[PDB]
Paper text:
The other three conformations, SD1, SD2, and SD3, all featuring an open CP gate, were refined to nominal resolutions of 4.2, 4.3, and 4.9 Å, respectively. In the SD1 state, we only observed ordered nucleotide densities in Rpt1, Rpt3, Rpt4, and Rpt5. The potential nucleotide densities in Rpt2 and Rpt6 appear to be very weak, suggesting either a partial occupancy or disordered nucleotide configuration within these nucleotide-binding sites. In line with the observations of disordered nucleotide densities, the Rpt2 and Rpt6 densities in the SD1 map, the Rpt2 density in the SD2 map, and the Rpt6 density in the SD3 map were of lower quality at slightly lower local resolutions than the other Rpt subunits in the same map, indicating that their conformations are destabilized, potentially due to nucleotide release. Similar to our SD1 state, a recent study on the yeast proteasome in complex with ADP-aluminum fluoride (AlFx) showed that the apo-like states in Rpt2 and Rpt6 allow the ATPase to adopt a different conformation when the CP gate is still closed. Although the AAA-ATPase module in the SD1 state was in a conformation with its nucleotide-binding configuration quite different from that in SA, the pore-loop pairing architecture in SD1 resembles the one in SA. In the SD1 state, the amino (N)-terminal proteasome-cyclosome-initiation factor (PCI) domain of the lid subunit Rpn6 directly contacted the CP subunit α2. The constrictions narrowed by the pore loops are substantially reconfigured in the SD2 and SD3 structures, so that the AAA channel is widened overall relative to that in the SD1 state. Given the similarity of pore-loop architecture between SA and SD1, we speculate that the SD1 state likely represents the conformation in which the holoenzyme prepares to accept an incoming substrate via the pore loops, and that conformational change from SD1 to either SD2 or SD3 might be manifestation of the preferred movement of the pore loops to engage an incoming substrate.
A set of ubiquitylation pathways conjugate ubiquitin moieties on target proteins, which are then recognized and degraded by the 2.5-MDa 26S proteasome holoenzyme. The proteasome is composed of a 28-subunit barrel-shaped core particle (CP) and two 19-subunit regulatory particles (RP)5–8 capped at both sides of the CP. Substrate entry into this chamber for degradation is controlled by the axial channel in the center of a heptameric α-ring, also called the CP gate, positioned on each side of the CP. The globular domains of a substrate are mechanically unfolded by a heterohexameric ring-like subcomplex in the base consisting of six distinct subunits, Rpt1−6, which belong to the ATPases-associated-with-diverse-cellular-activities (AAA) family.
Author numbering:
A (entry chain B): 330 to 440
B (entry chain G): 6 to 244
C (entry chain D): 365 to 418
D (entry chain P): 2 to 205
E (entry chain M): 5 to 244
F (entry chain I): 4 to 251
G (entry chain J): 2 to 240
H (entry chain H): 5 to 234
Write the structure that this text describes.
């Protein structure tokens, strides 16, 4: 399992050694909701949000995004000593997770 | 230290640069000894030759180079840098004579040669002329002068003067020698030059090895001595 | 006045070179030429030294 | 002449503690005038004027060039300019066109920046400065203004008599002049204030 | 060493390895000697045929720059051709600007400055040549010069440039050079070239002899070596 | 890794020297300009406040550039002289060509192009200097601009310098003003910003510098104001600190 | 073979900085552009108003002539220089042959300048990719795009910046034959592109139009709210 | 092994081939300059290496015009080049304006020259820091520049070895209001504080700047003054 | 190592030219066949998007009224070379009132196909096929980035050129006819391409001595496709 | 090995390896043989191809009415020196209104090629010229090198595996001088048929022959006046 693929030996990606190379792209904006479903399947939460609000926010998607959103929402929940996590925790968690980290680089560049 | 491998002319940490102070011993690859003496209204140069060969000539080996009719000089270090610096000095003295209408003083030429070496030092991408030049000259209202020109571009000028290979010892002897306030009636100067080189080298040798360059305020023409009068002075100092 | 680059262990060795050279002089008297030979022997590259750019 | 293509007349006269500069208003081709509001006196900083007479193209181009170098000098150095500095600058600007000359006769009139010391000078078309104490004149008509100013000038002059003297001199010399006329502007400045008057001239 | 790359840098002991590497490059080249007499200068070059592919009269290292000045080069050949062209150009300029023949010392100094300037900068290399300059004049006599790859140019009576640089001047100096005319010095140079390296490392060599002096009335040219045939009838007597 | 020159890119595509020029900006003097109609201000922090100077220049960061424009500056100080002489020359060329004062935006873009030509070309040092802009025109009135070493320029109303001014920008957002053109209010706001952001205990007036630019009847004068009104501004702001401790 | 420099190839036949300079565009702001039959329209996303300054200076859509319209991606400074050059090129072309400037000639100019700028010695290539929209020959709508290599490449719709594959993929599923004109459907097409944008914040949308004969018209953030309202109405009618 | 050379910044800091040039400047000969109420006094520390050298040949205190003194702390061969530049440039000003150039304008143009030489990337910068002074428009001035192209204005400052100690003494001993002679006294004091003790009429070299003009003093008046001045 | 155009190899060679020959390979294929009836020529477009307008991508351009071309590699080096040829042809007609023959065209292009030099820039990354009719009948001409120009009777370039040349030498002889060579070429095209052959994939360019004008086939190429 | 990169750098043994690498780049060209009689100079080269359908790359190209060259090595430098060669011909043809002596022309070639072997920024020219001409003293066969040490010979051969050709020249350089044109040309191809492996035969389409005579203008031939020259041969002694 690798992050990058370009700096690797062509003698080691040839078959005989490795027969099933497997792409992991960031798959789709639909199974974002499945990861939000699974990573909130065992935590009490209100309705109060749409995952489409967290689909039309950022263009690259990962479980590293959504689990960070969940954990930061829990931090904002114990920050405000509530349960049944509301929308404002998701919004501040959204902004603080997209900033930390995905921006690149100090302005500007590009913009 | 280095560290930076001192390839081009940049500043190394604390705080020096190494190219020019490697060029300070480009003189020391010469294998030669040069002595200048200014005591009174004459001025004396002395420098040996290194001729092992009988197939090699004797007239073309002289490092006493007449710059102008009232300015001579002497060279050490490697010969090509020396001869190039000599033609540059000749050309710039001629430019002085063309532009300003009179004979150049010996100091201004040293300033110009130092400026040329600094410009070759300031800008990179040219080898900075590893040869040392010693000048002498007579000026009106000032008597005689001796100057020294560095490859570093630091000209200076003073009474008892020496550069080459073995001149830490020569400057030590001239510190011990020019401290007594005697007059210098030109055979005193010849005797001190011959004996100071004859104590640094300790050879006490034939009149065929050293060349003697003199200039005097009775004839301001630069003058190269002959074998007979060099022998005359040598046996005159022989006691 | 000659820099720099003398270590503390070198002084006594310079003095020994001077003194044993005076032993070769067969005299108990310490002249300057003893220090000349001592400087030329126990210094021990490099040296020129300087007076450019201060 | 080439100097007599658009006409022109500039008079400056040094008073007691003040200085006055005046010029004509007419602009036009050789005999055909165009307008009566052509500026030939240009403010160069405070309490320091310049007068230009001759070819109007060189007048405007030299005025803008001097404004250029003047603003660069006063913004490199926060102090204002002394009049001798202006005179050397103008002489340099003219002498750069030694063989390609502009066709003008600049007249500088200004006061001292520290004291109230008056100042007059005038230059040639190649940059020859000339400081006097009584008056300087330029333009197409010369001898008229020379005769009038040598006729009516006194050394120590209150600003009223200075004003009336330069008034009568300009009016009579312009009325004798043919190619320059059609009204007179007068600038009288001093340490306290700057006065600008326009005279009722013969519009013939 | 390392520290040997560019021609503008110095060494930590203070010399230029580019100059040194350019010097000992000519050491591998063919042997070329020279010696003057009391009224002329004689050149002579040990020149080699490769195997059987030459023509005996091609690419002769005995050049002829001026009416009375010619070269006896050794080292890289094309670099010597270029330097010969610069010498021809300089002699032409002196003839143009002064109206008489170039004195050899001034010519040698100008060429030495040209060599030195090509040692100075870093974009160019030092030359890979070492050559001779001979001349004759009725008001100046014979002058024989010598130019290293660095630019140190001064005079001799005799020289050698090649492998046997020491091994030629070992016995050049036992020649009684002053009292002899150059016609004797012809077969002298013949025996000097012939003694060194008869057959040892290589197979065959070939002799050229350039020739300037009082006998040619100021001309510089190759001898008619075939005329009077001085080498081989003496070479067969010099093997014993 | 992919360092050596300003040109060409590092493979992201990101840049090396623009980022390092901003990190060269951050360790320099702090300046600001404020939201104001009928006038505009500049503030500056005195570097090198050692007692053996002369202060006979009257201006260390401020440069009254054409007539109606000044510029603060921050960064490598000699490059600021290099750019300011050229910028005065650009403005004076514009005045030579048109006999109209320069309307400041094409002036800003011209200087940005001067900096940008050294960003693309190689191998040259780009100007590690950001600098401010105040000015007046015939088309928009009082203006504020932020030059950058990238060649990007920002039209601001409350500006930003580096690490010593990120907290200043935070206070400018949290204490944002709009509608009040009263200059003394913005001067008290700037005094509060330099009181918190500079580490100067009790804000000595020798460590500060204030320049303003007002529109007077045709002239658009630039006021490099003196020290005594700064002193009473300090006393006014400390009386406001006493008003702040009235809640105790 | 390496990421330096621009001049040498890869061992498998590539240019690294040509391939790498497109990544600066690919991490840049998104700007789309379509052609109608009569009215052409485009827009950028990510206005990103930071609450305390003006944004009339950050306008990424401009014009060189009254007939051509601009957009770009990547970094802004290269776009500034290229457009400032292209205005003078358009006006120099107008100083020549008296036609309104064709979109094809000015795209050949910009891409050609960009390429011969790239080929030279150590000049950092302009990491932008422009969108050049015009309708000149009897109102024939044309839009070309550029490349950091400098290849003009004619499209019918376009999407660049962040996530351009998805945004272009929406136009694959949107762009049927009967788009225009039907100007209202081209309007709703731009609105659906802005709704299909990577963030689609609703107020950060900035779009500009051209009816092939008029001038550039900047719209108003109340008309676009009505467009989002009727698009949500169409989504509800899909239910 | 970086910076190297003059074309790039550091990863975060400043320019190493300026910092090392300043280091070579700080490794230079000591000097001091004091701006008094009526004049400005410059003085150096000039020890010959041997007793062979001559003290009428090379001159540290150097006039640029008849009213402008200028000394340095650094490397002479570069010092002469930039001085000759300042000479020609001041003469160009006197050609244009026919008026003696003000010292602030000299500092502007000399600073522009030095900053141009610090521009990338083929030459090194100077190993020279300057001390420029003169009595222009009554008020005298004192302007210190540096190899980075910047400049300052001091009441009193020093450059060379132990300049921090000389600066603490000038902070302690000197003040705002003195005369020319009192400035001469405290200048010789702060020079003798850090020099070697064998100080004669020749080891120092002093130039002053009256309102009557620049003046480069002689060893006669030096040995008249410095013969146990305190 | 090999690091630059100013350094040989210990065995040969450039080692920049080699990487240019390697940079031939990335392009789309093209096939021209010389027939004495006239020169036929073909190319693949490799269209990515339906938004990608197919008639906008140029592969066959027109240098002269009887001279075609085809490009293979970097587009813009090819555009520069086409620009220079378009200039130079017109100068030859200018100074001689006649048509520059295609071999002389190729000598003029290959004069600075290698004039690459950055001091005293890089070598170009495109191989070009030239088809035309001089006085000696039709001519088909094949050059390279290295300027080593030679005539070819039926040359194939670019990606999958090996089996293209193989099956080409399988089918070729000297006395071919026109439409037979056309269908023989497009067979090899649809053997080396990955997409279904249709009106948008390929384009033909046919020059004849009696049909000098219009070295192109537009949508009759559909009819040529449907005959297989 | 870090010193074996550039032309300017002297080796620590003094041998510029850039020159020898240029020599080895020359050695990968085609075979060619040049040889003269007292009256007729003939140079014969070998053609090669990219493919079977492709044409053969020509080697012998025309220069002037009495000068023609062979070539081996690079092609861009070949046409560059061709343009320079034609220019140097027609310049003196314009000025002096005479045909050139060959020796000063090839000295001009050496002086042309010296500067790209000494300064930095241009590589030495991989070049394989064999030059045949007629001055007042008859035919000359010169050869070149990337080191600009031009050689005069009577019979040479350069390119790949040209050593057997050189030995053939060794064993017939006595015989070349007296014969007329026909058997001289078939001696030339009895060097070229040993520049090949013996499992194939020299055909028509692979060879070209250029004759210039003391009364005959320089002319290149290909298959058509060469099929007359290709008869009059025996097989190789297998």
């Amino acid at each position: 399992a690798t992050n990058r693929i370009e700096t690797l030996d062509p003698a080691l990606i040839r078959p005989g050694r490795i027969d099933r190379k497997i792409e992991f792209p960031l798959p789709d904006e639909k199974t974002k909701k499945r990861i939000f479903q699974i990573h909130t399947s065992r935590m009490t939460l209100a309705d109060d949000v749409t995952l489409d609000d967290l689909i039309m926010a950022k263009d690259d998607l990962s479980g590293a995004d959504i689990k960070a959103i969940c954990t930061e929402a829990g931090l904002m929940a114990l920050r405000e000593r509530r349960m049944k996590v509301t929308n404002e925790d998701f919004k501040k968690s959204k902004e603080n997770v997209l900033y930390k980290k995905q921006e690149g680089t100090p302005e500007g560049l590009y913009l | 230290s280095a560290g930076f491998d001192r390839h081009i002319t940049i500043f190394s940490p604390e705080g020096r640069l190494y190219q020019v102070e490697y060029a300070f011993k480009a003189i020391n690859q010469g294998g030669l000894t040069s002595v200048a003496v200014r005591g009174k209204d004459c001025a004396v140069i002395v420098t040996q030759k290194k001729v092992p060969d009988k197939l090699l000539d004797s007239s073309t080996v002289t490092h006493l180079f007449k710059i102008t009719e009232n300015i001579g000089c002497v060279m050490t270090g490697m010969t090509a840098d020396s001869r190039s610096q000599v033609q540059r000095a000749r050309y710039e003295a001629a430019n002085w004579k063309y532009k300003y209408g009179y004979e150049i003083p010996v100091d201004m030429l040293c300033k110009r040669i130092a400026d040329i070496s600094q410009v070759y030092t300031q800008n990179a991408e040219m080898r900075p002329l590893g040869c040392c030049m010693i000048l002498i000259g007579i000026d009106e209202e000032q008597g005689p002068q001796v100057y020294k020109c560095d490859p570093a571009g630091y000209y200076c000028g003073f009474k008892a003067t020496a550069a080459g290979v073995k001149q830490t010892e020569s400057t030590s002897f001239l510190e011990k020698k020019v401290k007594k306030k005697f007059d210098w009636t030109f055979e005193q100067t010849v005797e001190t030059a011959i004996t100071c080189l004859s104590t640094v080298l300790s050879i006490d040798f034939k009149p065929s090895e050293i060349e003697v360059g003199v200039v005097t305020v009775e004839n301001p023409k630069f003058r190269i001595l002959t074998e007979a009068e060099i022998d005359a002075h040598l046996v005159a100092l022989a006691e | 006045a000659r820099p720099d680059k003398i270590s503390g262990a070198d002084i006594n060795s310079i003095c020994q070179e001077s003194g044993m050279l005076a032993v070769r002089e067969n005299r108990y008297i310490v002249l300057a030429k003893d220090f000349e030979k001592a400087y030329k022997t126990v210094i021990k590259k490099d040296e020129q030294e300087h007076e450019f750019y201060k | 002449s080439i100097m007599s293509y658009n006409g022109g007349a500039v008079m400056a006269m040094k008073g007691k503690n003040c200085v006055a500069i005046a010029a004509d208003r007419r602009f036009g081709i050789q005999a055909q005038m165009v307008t009566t509001d052509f500026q030939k006196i240009f403010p160069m900083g405070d309490r320091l004027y310049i007068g230009l007479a001759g070819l109007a193209t060189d007048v405007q181009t030299v005025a803008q060039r001097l404004k250029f170098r003047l603003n660069l000098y006063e913004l490199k150095e926060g102090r204002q300019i002394k009049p001798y500095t202006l005179m050397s600058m103008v002489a340099n600007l003219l002498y750069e066109k030694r063989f390609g000359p502009y066709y003008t006769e600049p007249v500088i009139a200004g006061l001292d920046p520290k004291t109230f010391k008056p100042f007059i000078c005038s230059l040639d078309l190649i940059g020859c400065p000339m400081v006097t104490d009584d008056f300087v004149v330029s333009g197409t008509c010369a001898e008229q203004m020379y005769g009038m100013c040598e006729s009516l000038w006194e050394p120590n002059m209150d600003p009223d008599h200075l004003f009336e003297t330069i008034s009568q001199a300009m009016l009579n010399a312009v009325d004798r002049d043919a190619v320059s006329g059609m009204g007179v502007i007068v600038h009288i400045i001093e340490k306290d204030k700057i006065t600008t008057r326009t005279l009722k001239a013969r519009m013939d | 060493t390392g520290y040997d790359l560019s021609a503008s840098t110095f060494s930590p002991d203070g010399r230029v390895f580019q100059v040194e590497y350019a010097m000992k490059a000519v050491e591998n080249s063919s042997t070329a000697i020279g010696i003057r007499c009391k009224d002329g200068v004689v050149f002579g070059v040990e020149k080699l045929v490769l195997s059987k592919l030459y023509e005996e009269g091609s690419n002769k290292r005995l050049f002829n720059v001026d009416r009375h000045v010619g070269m006896a080069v050794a080292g890289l050949l094309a670099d010597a051709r270029s330097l010969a062209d610069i010498a021809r150009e300089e002699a032409s300029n002196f003839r143009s600007n002064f109206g008489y023949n170039i004195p050899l010392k001034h010519l040698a100094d100008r060429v030495a400055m040209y060599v030195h300037a090509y040692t100075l900068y870093s974009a160019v290399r030092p030359f890979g040549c070492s050559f001779m300059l001979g001349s004759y004049s009725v008001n100046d006599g014979a002058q024989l010069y010598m130019i290293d790859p660095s630019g140190v140019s001064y005079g001799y009576w005799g020289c050698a440039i090649g492998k046997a640089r020491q091994a030629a001047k070992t016995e050049i100096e036992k020649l009684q050079m002053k009292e002899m005319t150059c016609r004797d010095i012809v077969k002298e140079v013949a025996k000097i070239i012939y003694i060194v390296h008869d057959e040892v490392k290589d197979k065959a060599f070939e002799l050229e002899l350039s020739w300037v002096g009082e006998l040619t009335n100021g001309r510089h040219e190759i001898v008619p070596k075939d005329i009077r045939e001085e080498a081989e009838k003496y070479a067969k007597e010099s093997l014993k | 890794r992919y360092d050596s020159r300003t040109t060409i890119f590092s493979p992201e595509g990101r840049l090396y020297q623009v980022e390092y020029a901003m990190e060269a900006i951050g360790h320099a003097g702090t300046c600001l300009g404020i939201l104001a109609n009928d006038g505009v201000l500049l503030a500056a922090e005195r570097r090198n406040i050692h007692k053996l100077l002369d202060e006979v220049f009257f201006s260390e960061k401020i440069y009254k550039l054409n007539e109606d424009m000044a510029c603060s500056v921050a960064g490598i100080t000699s490059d600021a002289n290099v750019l300011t002489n050229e910028l005065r020359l650009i403005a004076q060329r514009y005045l030579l060509q048109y006999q109209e004062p320069i309307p400041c935006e094409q002036l800003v873009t011209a200087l940005c192009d001067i900096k940008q030509a050294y960003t693309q070309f190689g191998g040259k040092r780009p100007f590690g200097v950001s600098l401010l802009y105040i000015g007046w025109d015939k088309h928009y009135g009082f203006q504020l601009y932020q030059s950058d070493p990238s060649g990007n320029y920002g039209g601001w109303k409350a500006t930003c310098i580096g690490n010593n001014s990120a907290a200043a920008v935070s206070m400018l957002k949290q204490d944002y003003k709009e509608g009040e053109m009263t200059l003394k209010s913005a001067l008290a706001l700037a005094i509060k910003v330099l009181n918190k952001t500079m580490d100067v205990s009790k804000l000595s007036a020798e460590k500060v510098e204030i320049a303003t630019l007002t529109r007077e009847n045709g002239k658009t004068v630039i006021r490099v104001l003196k020290q005594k009104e700064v002193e009473q501004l300090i006393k006014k702001h400390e009386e406001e600190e006493a008003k702040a401790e009235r809640e105790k | 073979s390496y990421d330096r420099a621009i001049t040498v190839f890869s061992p498998d036949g590539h240019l690294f900085q040509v391939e790498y300079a497109q990544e600066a565009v690919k991490k840049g702001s998104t700007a789309v552009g379509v052609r109608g039959r009569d009215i052409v329209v485009l827009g950028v996303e990510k206005k990103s108003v930071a609450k305390l300054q003006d944004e009339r200076t950050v306008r990424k859509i401009c014009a060189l002539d009254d007939n051509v319209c601009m957009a770009f991606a990547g970094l802004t400074a290269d776009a500034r220089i290229v457009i400032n050059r292209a205005r003078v090129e358009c006006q120099s072309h107008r100083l020549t042959v008296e036609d309104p400037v064709t979109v094809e000639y000015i795209t050949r100019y910009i891409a050609s300048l960009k390429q011969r700028y790239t080929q030279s010695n150590g000049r950092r290539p302009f990491g932008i990719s422009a969108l050049i929209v015009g309708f000149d020959f009897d109102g024939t709508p044309r839009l070309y795009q550029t490349d950091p290599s400098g290849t003009y490449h004619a499209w019918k719709a376009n999407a660049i910046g962040r996530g351009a594959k998805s945004v272009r993929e929406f136009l694959e599923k949107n762009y049927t034959d009967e788009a225009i004109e039907t100007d209202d459907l081209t309007i709703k097409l731009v609105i659906k592109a802005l709704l299909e944008v990577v963030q689609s914040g609703g107020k950060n949308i900035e779009l500009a139009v051209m009816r092939r004969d008029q001038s550039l018209k900047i719209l108003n953030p109340e008309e676009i709210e009505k467009y989002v309202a009727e698009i949500e109405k169409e989504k509800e009618e899909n239910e | 092994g970086y910076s190297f050379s003059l074309t790039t910044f550091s990863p975060s800091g400043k320019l190493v081939q300026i910092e090392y040039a300043l280091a070579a400047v700080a490794g230079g000969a000591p000097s001091v300059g004091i701006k008094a109420a009526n004049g400005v006094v410059l003085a150096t520390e000039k020890k010959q290496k041997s007793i062979l050298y001559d003290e009428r040949s090379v001159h540290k205190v150097e006039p640029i015009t008849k009213h402008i003194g200028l000394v340095y702390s650094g490397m002479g061969p570069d010092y002469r080049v930039l001085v000759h530049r300042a000479r020609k440039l001041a003469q160009q000003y006197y050609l244009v304006y026919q008026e003696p150039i003000p010292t602030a304008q000299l500092v502007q143009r000399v600073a522009s020259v030095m900053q141009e030489y610090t521009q990338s990337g083929g030459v090194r910068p100077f190993g020279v820091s300057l001390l420029i002074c003169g009595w222009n428009e009554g008020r005298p001035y004192l302007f210190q520049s540096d190899p980075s192209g910047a400049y300052f204005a001091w009441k009193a400052t020093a450059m060379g070895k132990n300049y921090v100690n000389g600066k603490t003494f000038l902070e302690k001993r000197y003040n705002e209001d003195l005369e020319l002679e009192d400035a001469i006294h405290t200048a010789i004091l702060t020079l003798k504080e850090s020099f070697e003790g064998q100080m004669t009429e020749d080891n120092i070299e002093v130039g002053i700047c009256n309102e009557a003009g620049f003046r480069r003093l002689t060893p006669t008046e030096v040995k008249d003054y410095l013969a146990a001045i305190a | 190592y090999d690091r630059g155009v100013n350094t040989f190899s210990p065995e040969g060679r450039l080692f920049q030219v080699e990487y240019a020959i390697e940079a031939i390979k990335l392009g789309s294929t093209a096939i021209g066949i010389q027939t004495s009836e006239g020169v036929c020529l073909a190319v693949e477009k490799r269209i990515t998007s339906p938004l990608m307008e197919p008639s906008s991508i140029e592969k066959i351009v027109e240098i002269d009224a009887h001279i075609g071309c085809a490009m293979s590699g970097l587009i813009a080096d090819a555009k520069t070379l086409i620009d220079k040829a378009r200039v130079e042809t017109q100068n030859h007609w200018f100074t001689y009132n006649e048509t520059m023959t295609v071999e002389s065209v190729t000598q003029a292009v290959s004069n600075l196909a290698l004039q690459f030099g950055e001091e005293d820039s890089r070598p170009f990354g495109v191989a070009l096929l030239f088809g035309g009719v001089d006085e000696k009948g039709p001519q088909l001409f094949h050059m390279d980035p290295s300027g080593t120009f030679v005539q070819c009777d039926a040359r194939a370039i670019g990606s999958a050129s090996e089996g293209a040349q193989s099956s080409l030498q399988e089918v070729y002889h000297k006395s071919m006819t026109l439409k037979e060579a056309i269908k023989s070429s497009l067979i090899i095209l649809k053997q080396v391409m990955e997409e279904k052959l249709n009106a948008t994939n390929i384009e033909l360019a046919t020059v004849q001595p009696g049909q000098n004008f219009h070295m192109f086939t537009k949508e009759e190429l559909e009819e040529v496709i449907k005959d297989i | 090995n870090q010193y074996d990169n550039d032309v300017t750098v002297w080796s620590p043994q003094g041998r510029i390896h850039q020159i020898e690498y240029a020599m080895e780049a020359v050695k990968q060209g085609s075979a060619t043989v040049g040889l003269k009689s007292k009256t007729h100079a003939v140079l014969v080269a070998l053609k090669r191809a990219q493919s079977e359908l492709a044409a053969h790359q020509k080697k012998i190209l025309h220069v002037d009415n009495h000068i023609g060259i062979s070539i081996a090595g690079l092609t861009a430098d070949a046409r560059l020196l061709c343009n320079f060669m034609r220019q140097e011909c027609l310049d003196s043809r314009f000025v002096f209104d005479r045909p050139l002596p060959v020796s000063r022309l090839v000295s001009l070639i050496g002086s042309k090629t010296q500067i790209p072997t000494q300064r930095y920024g241009r590589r030495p020219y991989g070049v394989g010229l064999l030059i045949a001409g007629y001055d007042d003293m008859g035919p000359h066969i010169f050869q070149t090198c990337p080191s600009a040490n031009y050689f005069d010979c009577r019979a040479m051969s350069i390119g790949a595996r040209s050593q057997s050709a050189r030995t053939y020249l060794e064993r017939h350089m006595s015989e070349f001088m007296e014969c007329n044109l026909n058997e001289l040309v078939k001696h030339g191809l009895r060097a070229l048929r040993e520049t090949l492996p013996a499992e194939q035969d020299l055909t028509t389409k692979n060879v070209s022959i250029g004759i210039v005579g003391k009364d005959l203008e320089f002319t290149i031939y290909d298959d058509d006046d060469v099929s007359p020259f290709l008869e009059g041969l025996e097989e190789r002694p297998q």
